[PDB]
Amino acid sequence: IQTQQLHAAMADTFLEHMCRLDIDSAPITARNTGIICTIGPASRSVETLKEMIKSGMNVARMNFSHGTHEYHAETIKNVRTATESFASDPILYRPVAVALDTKGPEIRTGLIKGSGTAEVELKKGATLKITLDNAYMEKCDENILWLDYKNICKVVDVGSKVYVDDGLISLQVKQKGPDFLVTEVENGGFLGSKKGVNLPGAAVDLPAVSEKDIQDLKFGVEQDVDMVFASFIRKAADVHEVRKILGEKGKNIKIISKIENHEGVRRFDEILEASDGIMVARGDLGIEIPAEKVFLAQKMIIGRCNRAGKPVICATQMLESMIKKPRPTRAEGSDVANAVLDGADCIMLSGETAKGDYPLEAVRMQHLIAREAEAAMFHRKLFEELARASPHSTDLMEAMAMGSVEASYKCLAAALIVLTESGRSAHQVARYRPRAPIIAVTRNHQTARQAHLYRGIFPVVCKDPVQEAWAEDVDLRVNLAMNVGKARGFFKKGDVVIVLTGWRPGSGFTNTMRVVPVP
């Protein structure tokens, strides 16, 4: 029989835990891993968004690497419209967050000359001249290649390698002429317009926060986005610049630093301290450093974020092949599962959702794999190691959290209900990775939206006004969670859930926990 890999949960070793994984051990209804969907022409329509939400989407990511403000404003407007089309039912309403992915220090090449083939082919052992002559800005070809990085020449050297499109195409500088570069094509073949360019071994002096960026972040504040995915941040200083720009009015916007180059990996510790969360941007990371090493950086990053208690996102190409096909490849399914097992708080879709033919099938697939992997976690082991690395604490919530999660493990609670406004308490509970869903009730619409960044936290926005008597106000928000839970099939009348509340309205966190029957 058994359910949600409970037999394997009892194992005393990882080897036995693995040997006990059962494909016939049904996972639970609730899904703990937040799904982040990148919105594009394939999913901008309010009607598709509505389905995006029912299928699982928690975070709508706007990639400011392309598109104008009015563009992104309309799409932001549509996700909100689709979201609120549900607001009518307080029990079935699923909050949805809006994220903003910075363009950052990108290098991009121009448009191929119209006058000639659709795409130019850089054949191995062929010459190619890279120029900055704005004249060739839209007249690229097998001979001339224009880039949008002016100082490029001062940071590269003879012998330096240049990667272009998703470092599918490789170039080697042979002559470093003043204001231009004569190179030789090593790899790749076909080149299109506006393609990504990477200088792995160089020190790109572009700004962390460029003019263009400053305006986009400002725009986010204006548009009231919940988070910011800062691209190519390579040190604490960068995070701080982004923090400063968001300034006072955007103080509450959570900054998620994207790690996508050797520098950022090397200075990860100081970056994590300055950020609210981290994103393993495997795409550029896999170009900036050898592809075979990404898995190392991913696990290291997810590991340290877990230990720190800050959200971490795994992104890029997870279900890549589903851009053109309805079902994922065996490796891609594996990729998602291992990301969840590695400890990732959220998994992302960018392309499979932005411009793919199967956006809805893709999020549904991550949703399926998520629940399955989440159950295959070795909680007993993870908890212990995670509490070990928990320094001596003068913060009582950490204790409440560990006690509660432990309590949830013992009575196989159906869920952990947490009343919070800043979201802190719930964040703490999620940190110690309980198996059961963390139903966080709050009146702060934003902390609800931001809650998705945390593994296990199921945000529930309470719209009822604050009751006179604190006890009644509590039983109110608690019953709301109870109902949402019954509605979502997380638990029925008679199951056990642990409830974390504040003893008195003035309590600075959840200092009260109870084991309670759902009825």
Cβ closest to a copy of itself, residue 265 vs residue 451: 265
Amino acid found at 218: K
User: Which positions make up the binding site for L-serine?
Assistant: 58, 94, 452
For residue 132, give both structure tokens: 């900055």
Q: Residue 499 corresponds to which tokens in the numbers above?
A: 């409830």
| 210 interacts with K ion by CB under 5 A | no
Q: Cβ distance 226 to 446 under 8 Å? A: yes
What is the rounded distance in angstroms from the CA atom of residue 35 to the CA atom of residue 57? 5
Task: Name the segment binding a copy of itself (CB under 8 A); options: 38-46, 50-58, 198-206, 318-326.
Answer: 318-326
334 counts as binding a copy of itself under rule CB under 8 A: yes
Interaction between residue 213 and K ion (CB under 5 A): no
| 3-state secondary structure string across 167-230 | CCEEEEEEECCCCEEEEEECCCCEECCCCCEECCCCCCCCCCCCHHHHHHHHHHHHHCCCEEEE
Active site residue 234: no
Contact set for Mn ion, span 264-283 (CB under 5 A): 281, 283
What residues form the annotated binding site? Answer: 58, 61, 63-66, 94, 101-102, 108, 195, 258, 260, 283-284, 316, 420-425, 452, 470, 477, 504-509
Of 150, 67, 133, 143, nearest to 112 (Cα)? 143
Residue from 258, 371, 435, 449 carrying the catalytic annotation? 258
Residues of span 77-116 touching a copy of itself by CB under 8 A: none
Residues pairing with 162 in the sheet: 171
Residues between 226 and 255 with contacts to K ion, criterion CB under 5 A: 231
Residues 364-403 touching Mn ion, rule: CB under 5 A, are none
Specify the residue, 179 or 385, whose C-beta has the smaller distance to a copy of itself: 385
Residue closer to K ion by CB (options 101, 374) is 101
User: Taking the complex as a whole, how short is the minimal distance between the CB of residue 167 and a copy of itself, in angstroms?
Assistant: 6
Check binding of 2 to a copy of itself (CB under 8 A). no
In whole angstroms, what is the distance from residue 341 CA to residue 330 CA? 16
Residues 313-352 that bind K ion (CB under 5 A): none
What part of residues 268-287 is at the interface with a copy of itself (CB under 8 A)?
A: 282-283, 286
Could you confirm whether 44 is annotated as catalytic? no
**CA–CA separation, 285 and 291 (whole Å):** 8
Is 174 a known active-site residue?
no
Given the residues 31, 33, 61, 109, select the one marked as catalytic.
61
Element (H, E) at 59: strand 59-63
- Position among 400, 440, 451, 460 found at the interface with a copy of itself (CB under 8 A): 400
Taking CB atoms within 8 Å and a gap of at least 24, the contacts of 142-148 are 145/109, 145/191, 146/109, 146/110, 147/107, 147/108, 147/109, 147/110, 147/197, 148/106, 148/107, 148/108, 148/109, 148/110
Residue 513 interacting with a copy of itself (CB under 8 A): yes
Which residue lies nearer to a copy of itself by CB, 87 or 291? 291
Task: From residue 246, give the alpha-carbon distance in Å to each of 102, 216, 225, 242, 408.
Answer: 12, 10, 11, 6, 39
Residues 425-454 that bind a copy of itself (CB under 8 A): none
- 389 contacts a copy of itself (rule: CB under 8 A): yes
Residues 23-52 that bind a copy of itself (CB under 8 A): 23-24
266 assigned to active site? no
Note whether 284 binds Mn ion by CB under 5 A.
Answer: yes
Backbone angles phi, psi at 354, to 5 degrees: -65, -55
Query: Which DSSP string do the residues of 315-352 spell out, in sequence order?
Result: ESSTTGGGGT-SS--HHHHHHHHHHHHHT-SEEEESST
Question: Is 101 an interacting residue with respect to K ion (CB under 5 A)?
Answer: yes
Q: Choose from Mn ion, K ion, a copy of itself, none: what does 65 bind? Cβ within 5-8 Å by kind.
A: K ion
Residue stretches of the annotated binding site for K(+): 63, 65, 101-102
Binds 284, which of K ion, Mn ion, a copy of itself, none (CB < 5 to 8 A, cut-off by type)?
Mn ion
Binding residues for a copy of itself restricted to 180-219, rule: CB under 8 A? 187-188
Per-position DSSP letters for 368-403, written without gaps between them = HHHHHHHHTS-HHHHHHHHHHTS---S-HHHHHHHH
Pick from 252, 321, 444, 483 the residue near a copy of itself by CB under 8 A.
321
Q: How far is CA 462 from CA 388, 427, 441, in A?
A: 35, 18, 6
Does the footprint of a copy of itself cover residue 476 (CB under 8 A)?
no
Among a copy of itself, Mn ion, K ion, none, partner that 101 touches (CB below 5 to 8 angstroms by kind): K ion
The residue to which tokens 């800050």 are assigned: 310
Which listed residue (65, 210, 317, 444) binds a copy of itself by CB under 8 A?
Answer: 317
Q: At what angle do helices 396-410 and 379-388 cross, to 10 degrees?
A: 160
Active site residues: 61, 108, 258, 316
